[PDB]
């Protein structure tokens, strides 16, 4: 995830990267 | 069917122009509408275009050209050139038109303003750091914003010193089969 | 200059008696106990008292 390749994406692509970090945080607990 | 003005004769059926309606300036009256138009547009064209396409009568038109800065073809490399200029047109409307007020930063969540603001801040810091370097200077270590790694090493420092935690040697620095 | 100065003679000129002198004229503030310079006011208590006399007077 690059700083510049983060705004040139759609919220669809950006929301999936947030969902991936969410499931990763749940697995750590 | 009768326009308030005198229409031309050269008919254009499939125009490829893109007209942009921009927000007015703060102190401008509500009877002034500003548009970004093609550089080949003329005052007569805007009058006809607004009436026959949007049904908007105008009493007068103002036009000014905005020049673009001279730049190198590839930013920092290449020959020096100048992009095409921008043309803005301000039409005097017969009926006033008022723009809505921009949403508040708390209501822009439909656009993901939170994530957009974080990225914008990081881009601003990056251009500021480059400006300091462009001046032939650097940020001293005393002014580095303490990151999360620094805040974590200061918390442990207080635990070992206070006696809450007993220091022990590392166990994940290297995976040796000897384990000694 | 007629010749390039050698490493021995330039180090002499830079180090012999040019060492930074340690400041030993230090004591503690009587109001907070922080380290300060002798015969000088505490910079911490100065600003704090300077502001205390600005709110209530």
């Amino acid at each position: 995830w690059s700083l510049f390749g983060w705004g040139k994406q759609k919220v669809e692509e950006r929301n999936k990267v947030k969902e991936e970090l969410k499931q990763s945080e749940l697995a750590r607990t | 069917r009768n326009a308030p003005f005198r229409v031309g004769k050269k008919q254009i059926f499939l125009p490829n122009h893109v007209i942009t309606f921009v927000r007015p300036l703060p102190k401008q009256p509500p009877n002034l509408a500003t548009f970004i138009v093609p550089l080949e547009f003329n005052k007569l064209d805007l009058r006809d275009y607004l009436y026959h396409v949007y049904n908007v009568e105008v009493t007068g038109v103002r036009s000014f050209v905005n020049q673009r800065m001279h730049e190198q073809r590839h930013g920092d490399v290449g020959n020096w050139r100048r992009p095409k200029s921008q043309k803005m047109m301000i039409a005097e409307l017969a009926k006033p038109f008022v723009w809505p007020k921009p949403p508040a930063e708390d209501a822009r969540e439909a656009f993901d303003y939170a994530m957009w603001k974080k990225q914008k801040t990081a881009q601003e810091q990056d251009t500021k750091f480059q400006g300091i370097r462009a001046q032939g200077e650097v940020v001293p270590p005393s002014q580095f914003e303490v990151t999360k790694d620094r805040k974590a090493i200061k918390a442990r420092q207080s635990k070992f010193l206070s006696g809450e935690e007993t220091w022990a040697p590392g166990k994940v620095n290297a995976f040796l089969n000897s384990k000694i | 200059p007629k010749k390039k100065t050698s490493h021995m003679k330039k180090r002499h000129r830079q180090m012999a008696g040019k060492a930074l002198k340690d400041v030993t004229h230090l004591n503690r503030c009587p109001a907070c106990g922080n380290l300060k310079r002798m015969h000088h006011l505490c910079s911490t208590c100065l600003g704090k008292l300077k502001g205390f006399m600005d709110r209530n007077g």
């Binding site: - | 300036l25 102190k27 009877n31 009926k95 | -």
Partner: protein
């Protein structure tokens, strides 16, 4: 030398509270003038018709205002009514594409021009005390003293809202010795009738309150001929 006032509460001669600092209303700080106690003062030493109408022009982008006795303005009005507010902020001339009529004040009496010349005086004097001696906007309202000399000068040019409030005050009796009063001295006094024509109905709301002797109309004579339609609120 110069003597600046302070933003303290003071009494008003008008029948309204032109400012939140106004203490009282319709206060007589001086006996009536020679023409105040006159049912019909006339233009004794002025041209025929001069004073029956008073025009106000404003910059539609920056807010600079100019008062005129004729339906047009000239280069004199700009040199004599616009003080220095900063560099690149005072225009070197009048540009026809930026200056438009703001309002026109018409008195009921069609031959009492002296009443208008007085209303004109109070308007220009009030404007001078808005560009200079603006103590009521230093720490309150626009907070001109909390701004930079650049932003401060840009806000001193925006005299349009202040000008509209001056009209509501001058037409309500503001000023010492203004001929909008009519003392009978049988002692009963009242205000004279007037009509304000606006190009923008919304501009008349810069004044928090208008007097009962003024009627509002839309459209200034001469604008419809220039294909300049007025701005109405109710559409």
């Amino acid at each position: 030398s110069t003597h600046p006032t302070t933003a303290i509460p003071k009494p008003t001669t008008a029948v309204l509270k032109t400012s939140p600092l106004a203490e009282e209303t319709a206060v007589e700080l001086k006996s009536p003038s020679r023409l105040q106690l006159k049912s019909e003062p006339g233009n004794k030493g002025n041209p025929k018709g001069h004073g029956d109408r008073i025009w106000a022009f404003h910059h539609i982008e920056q807010g600079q205002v100019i008062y005129s006795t004729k339906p047009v303005i000239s280069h004199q009005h700009l040199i004599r009514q616009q003080p220095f507010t900063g560099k690149n902020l005072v225009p070197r001339k009048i540009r026809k594409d930026y200056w438009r009529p703001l309002a026109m004040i018409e008195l009921a009496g069609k031959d009492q021009g002296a009443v208008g010349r007085s209303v004109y005086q109070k308007l220009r004097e009030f404007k001078k005390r808005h560009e200079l001696d603006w103590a009521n906007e230093a720490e309150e309202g626009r907070k001109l003293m909390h701004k930079s000399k650049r932003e401060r000068g840009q806000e001193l040019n925006d005299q349009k809202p202040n000008s509209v409030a001056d009209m509501a005050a001058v037409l309500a009796g503001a000023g010492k010795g203004n001929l909008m009063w009519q003392v009978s001295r049988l002692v009963k006094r009242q205000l004279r009738r007037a009509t304000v024509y606006w190009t923008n109905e919304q501009d008349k709301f810069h004044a928090r309150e208008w007097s009962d002797n003024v009627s509002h109309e839309v459209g200034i004579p001469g604008e419809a001929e220039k294909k300049r339609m007025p701005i109405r609120m109710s559409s």
